[PDB]
């Protein structure tokens, strides 16, 4: 089970590609588009990238409520730990 920093760094690397935001600017305490200005369709891009190159499952139903990077990393961990 990867700890917080691993998924935070991976999502920061992906965000560097989707938008260009520097990786250290992606920290759990801050939020998504209401803070970092990452459109919901760019959120869909994050979802697709993390589906592909990290192999996790994120559906559209749960993507709407994902309003902080803390929430998305918590979702990744919560899907990860139970095999």
């Amino acid at each position: 089970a990867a700890t917080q920093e691993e998924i935070i760094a991976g999502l920061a690397e992906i965000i560097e590609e989707v938008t260009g935001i520097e990786p250290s600017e992606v920290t759990p305490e801050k939020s998504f588009v209401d803070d970092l200005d990452i459109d919901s369709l760019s959120m869909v891009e994050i979802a697709v990238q993390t589906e592909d190159k990290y192999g996790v499952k994120i559906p559209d139903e749960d993507l709407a409520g994902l309003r902080t990077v803390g929430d998305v990393v918590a979702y990744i961990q919560k899907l990860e730990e139970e095999n």
Partner: protein
């Protein structure tokens, strides 16, 4: 990108190959006249030689010993006052001058001069009189155009009396006038196309040096294509036509600037990623030279599929367009790459002046990938809704409406329609060839029966023969009537010199230029065949020629032509795509997307032209538009699919997203340029060329807006692993471990 191979050779030999291309262009443009000139003096026949109408007209000429070519021009004299003795003198002088020149005037049917048939030539109101002049050279040929010009010059030479103007019109004159209109409008169409390219490339690249170099590449490639095609035409090694010249100029310029956009955009993207000039150029070549070569192979093959057709207006698009596009693509791949290489070493010419727009295109690709089924359904419906134009689509063949009204042939038709019916000005020649002498009373009553039967055919207004010198006069010929000098003159005017055949002049009731006359030809042949039945001369030939027979042949040939050319071009483009991508499913997907986009293009073009423009769509427009769309839309889809294949390594869905983000701006720019250059044909005086250009431009606008941007990526996302069959590809790769914090 390994620094080696053909890219290495082009890079090291960039200056020598630039010099070689420039020298080749100079040789081709200085040893052979320009494309417009050679197209004028090496035009191809309007109708194929093997067509029944052309052989029928040739048989008419050789049996009657009057002419040997299928081209007739109508000379119409229209006077404000009724045509009196002065009009007769003017017409006789015109006829004498025409007969004085046998190099261009093979024969003149002096119907008006003879008082027996004079009222046949005159209008019912007695204000206009028409005379037929069989010229030299088959209709549409350069010899026929020269003969039409000679006839017009002869007509203008003779001083007309007070009033009474003489116009030269007719099918051969119509073809000569379409060449004249194209010559008038080629300068303006090329100027508009170049202005559109300049402005839109200025908007795209925002760099003056980059756009100047791009236009240098485009102009050199287009000049190379024009020079090669002119060299081929001037040596008679290939045929050529006005459609070939105009379409080749526009296709060459548009595809050359598309290849320029592809290479420049890929090079700029590689530069913006961070690769050095040499590495960026090598990446650009290894990722875009193959797709540009494949794009050119598809265009050349699609055009070449028109060479295996039957009519000369498509055989003239087969080989010339194929070779022109092939030399354009070689010019791009070699000269443009060399220019990019040399300009890279000089300053910052090809460095992008702004960050390439990917965020929007990446977002669009993510939307396509995440929900591929709804997007695909939406675009399929929005592209099939164009097929609603089928119940009402028309394919009018009347070149009257597709030419400027101020041209000599159109003015002659306008003068004719003011006093004659529309059908009279395009008559029909009918014959029966009797094995025995045909100057017999029984034979003459049989001829009268044939004339009556052809008259009774619906849609036929006038029949003219020896028995009926005009439209309308137990019919028996006393033997003393055979010795009448007037009747003997009528005989020699209407019978074969050996007295074994007759000629019938047929004037329809409706338009002879439309499917109504097309069915009229078969009805006339059937009526003649049933009339000749039960007669001592049963078994004669029913050779019928003229405009309506010619376009009956052309209409059936054009239906089969469009079907076979579409199938062949489709299969060959699919073969090329399979060769490039090595994926049968991806090639079939490109095929399907382009076909559906073509359906939408048909719908939109028919809607605009037949409903807001008001001009019916020409028949040859369908063939050229279908060919060019199957070429260029497949080229765009192939570029997208090649980028997707390159990006698969990082993943399948993310591969589509990255490919769309990287090529959205490039493909949008190229498609906008191509579509706008094709709609630049709308300024051409040839309204058929305008229709072709507007159809293709609207189709490629539709393509680069919805088809290649949504349908192809959505289909790719839906198929996933199967999209690259049989090539063993994977879905999302093995889940990489989460990276350690930095």
């Amino acid at each position: 990108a390994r620094p080696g191979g053909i890219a290495k050779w082009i890079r090291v030999l960039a200056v020598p190959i630039i010099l070689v291309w420039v020298a080749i262009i100079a040789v081709l443009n200085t040893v052979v006249p320009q494309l417009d000139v050679v197209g004028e003096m090496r035009s191809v026949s309007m109708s194929p030689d093997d067509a029944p109408s052309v052989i029928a007209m040739k048989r008419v000429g050789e049996v009657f010993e009057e002419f040997k070519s299928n081209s007739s021009v109508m000379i119409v004299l229209e006077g404000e006052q009724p045509l009196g003795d002065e009009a007769h003198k003017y017409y006789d002088e015109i006829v004498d001058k025409l007969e004085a020149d046998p190099a261009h005037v093979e024969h003149v049917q002096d119907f008006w001069g003879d008082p027996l048939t004079a009222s046949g030539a005159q209008s019912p109101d007695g204000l206009a009189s028409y005379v037929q002049v069989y010229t030299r050279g088959n209709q549409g040929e350069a010899l026929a155009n020269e003969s039409v010009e000679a006839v017009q010059d002869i007509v203008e030479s003779v001083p007309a009396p007070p009033g009474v103007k003489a116009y030269v019109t007719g099918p051969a004159a119509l073809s000569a006038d379409q060449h004249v209109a194209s010559d008038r409008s080629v300068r303006v169409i090329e100027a508009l196309t170049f202005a559109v390219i300049i402005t839109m490339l200025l908007l795209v690249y925002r760099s003056i040096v980059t756009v100047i170099l791009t236009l240098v590449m485009v102009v050199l490639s287009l000049s190379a294509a024009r020079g090669m095609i002119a060299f081929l035409g001037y040596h008679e090694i290939i045929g050529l036509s006005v459609f070939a010249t105009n379409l080749l100029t526009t296709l060459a310029i548009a595809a050359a600037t598309d290849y320029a956009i592809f290479l420049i955009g890929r090079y700029q993207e590689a530069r913006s990623v961070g690769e050095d000039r040499e590495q960026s150029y090598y990446t650009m070549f290894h990722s875009t030279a193959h797709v540009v070569l494949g794009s050119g192979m598809t265009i050349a093959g699609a055009t070449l599929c028109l060479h295996f057709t039957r009519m000369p207006y498509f055989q003239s698009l087969g080989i010339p367009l194929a070779i022109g596009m092939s030399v354009v693509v070689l010019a791009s791949l070699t000269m443009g790459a060399a220019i990019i290489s040399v300009a890279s070493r000089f300053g910052k010419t090809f460095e992008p002046k702004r960050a390439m727009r990917t965020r929007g295109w990446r977002k669009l690709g993510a939307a396509v990938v995440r929900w591929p089924a709804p997007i695909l359904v939406t675009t399929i419906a929005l592209s099939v809704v164009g097929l609603l134009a089928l119940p009402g689509y028309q394919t009018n063949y009347n070149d009257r409406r597709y030419l400027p009204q101020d041209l000599p042939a159109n003015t002659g038709y306008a003068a004719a329609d003011r006093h004659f019916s529309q059908a009279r000005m395009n008559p029909e020649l009918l014959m029966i060839e009797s094995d025995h002498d045909l100057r017999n009373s029984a034979d003459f009553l049989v001829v009268d029966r044939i004339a009556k039967r052809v008259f009774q055919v619906p849609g036929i207004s006038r029949v003219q023969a020896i028995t009926r010198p005009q439209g309308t006069p137990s019919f028996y010929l006393p033997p003393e009537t055979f010795e009448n000098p007037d009747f003997k003159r009528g005989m020699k005017m209407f019978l074969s010199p050996d007295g074994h055949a007759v000629r019938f002049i047929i004037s329809h009731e409706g338009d002879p230029m439309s499917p109504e006359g097309i069915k009229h030809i078969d009805a006339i042949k059937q009526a003649a065949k049933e009339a000749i039945k039960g007669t001592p001369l049963e078994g004669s030939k029913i050779y019928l020629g003229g405009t309506a027979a010619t376009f009956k042949d052309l209409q059936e040939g054009a239906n089969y032509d469009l079907i076979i050319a579409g199938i062949a071009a489709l299969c060959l483009i699919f073969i090329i795509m399979l060769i490039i991508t090595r994926a049968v499913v991806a090639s079939a997907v490109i095929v399907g997307t382009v076909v559906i986009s073509l359906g939408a293009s048909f719908g939109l073009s028919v809607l605009i032209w037949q409903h807001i423009i008001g001009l019916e769509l020409h028949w040859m427009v369908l063939a050229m538009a279908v060919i060019v769309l199957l070429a260029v839309g497949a080229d765009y889809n192939l570029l997208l699919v090649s980028r997707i294949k390159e990006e698969i390594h990082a993943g399948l869905n993310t591969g589509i997203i990255r490919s769309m983000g990287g090529t959205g701006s490039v493909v949008t720019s190229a498609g906008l340029v191509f579509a706008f250059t094709m709609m630049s044909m709308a300024v051409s005086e040839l309204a058929v060329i305008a229709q072709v250009g507007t159809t293709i431009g609207l189709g490629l606008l539709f393509d680069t807006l919805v088809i290649r941007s949504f349908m192809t990526p959505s289909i790719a996302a839906l198929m996933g692993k199967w999209f690259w069959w049989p090539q063993r590809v994977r879905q999302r790769p093995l889940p990489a471990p989460w990276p350690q914090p930095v």
